[PDB]
Amino acid sequence: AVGSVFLGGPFRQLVDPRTGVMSSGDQNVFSRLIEHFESRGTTVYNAHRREAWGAEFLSPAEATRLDHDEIKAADVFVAFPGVPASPGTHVAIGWASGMGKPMVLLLERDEDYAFLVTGLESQANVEILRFSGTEEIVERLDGAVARVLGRAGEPTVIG
Ligand SMILES: Nc1nc(=O)n([C@@H]2O[C@H](COP(=O)(O)O)[C@@H](O)[C@H]2O)cc1CO
Numbered sequence: 001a002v003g004s005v006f007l008g009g010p011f012r013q014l015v016d017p018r019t020g021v022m023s024s025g026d027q028n029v030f031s032r033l034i035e036h037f038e039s040r041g042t043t044v045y046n047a048h049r050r051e052a053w054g055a056e057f058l059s060p061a062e063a064t065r066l067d068h069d070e071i072k073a074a075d076v077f078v079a080f081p082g083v084p085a086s087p088g089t090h091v092a093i094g095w096a097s098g099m100g101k102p103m104v105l106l107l108e109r110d111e112d113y114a115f116l117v118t119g120l121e122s123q124a125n126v127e128i129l130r131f132s133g134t135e136e137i138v139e140r141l142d143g144a145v146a147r148v149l150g151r152a153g154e155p156t157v158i159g
Contacts, residue, residue, distance in 0.1 A: 002145055005037055006071045006096075007046040008089045009080030009106075015054040022053045029134045033078075036138050045070035071095050075152075076102040076145050083111045093117065097124045100159030102148035104129060106137060124158050125151050 007030065014026045027048070034044045047067060051058060058066070067088075071077060077096040079089050096103050102125050107113055109130040120126045127144045131137045 001040075002037075002042045002075055002149060004043045004045065004074040005076050005078050005145070006074035006092075007033055007044055007078050008067075008086075008092050009048075010082035010086035010089060011048055011054075012088070013082070013084070013086065021055050022048065027053055029137075032134050032138060033141070036141070040142075043074075045074055067092060068095060071101070072099065074101075076104065076149055078104045078106065078141070078145070080106045081113055081117055083108050083113075085114065090114070090117070093120070097126070097158055100125060100156060102145070102152055103127070104141065104144045104148060106131060108132075120158070124156050125154065 009030070011022075014022045016023060030046060030048050034046060034049065037044050047063070047070075050056075050066075051063075071092060072095075077092070079092060080086070081089055081093065093103070093105070097120050103120075104127050105117065105120075107128055107130050109132050118128070121128050125148055127148050129137065129140055129144050131140075
């Protein structure tokens with residue numbers, strides 16, 4: 001049973017400038033993923049919700065520090081690299097892969113992602129899960145987390 005996950009993904013690009021928040025459709029997937037885990041006993045660290053989906057904006061420095069602490073604390077790292085790419089999320093993949101964290105990465109099926117993203121499959125303790133909608137993710141996530149979590153500590157290139 002999984003104590004803690006860090007859930008990451010695009011943020012800045014999903015904020016509506018007119019409202020200063022993400023739309024319910026974009027919050028959709030995050031909230032769905034949060035519930036799923038929380039209902040099962042698993043603490044979810046997630047910046048989108050912590051920062052009221054754009055309304056309670058941090059300083060770059062605060063935001064940077066919290067994210068790195070939460071990543072380091074969570075048992076498993078789960079994130080959406082984003083199409084187009086989420087700059088802050090890619091920084092976080094660097095952090096997590098650099099700590100040898102169990103990671104699950106959520107990739108839109110039939111979309112292109114970076115070499116240094118896809119190249120972590122095998123190279124680190126990572127599992128890629130391609131998806132055409134949120135329910136697919138919700139169905140497959142627990143298995144993906146258990147498999148990566150069942151390899152924690154184990155040496156890897158990069159780990
Ligand atoms: N205010 C923010 N707080 C944050 O914690 N972040 C972190 O950086 C990621 C989003 O990066 P972008 O905002 O660059 O897409 C999120 O997963 C979040 O963990 C990003 C922003 C906006 O750059």
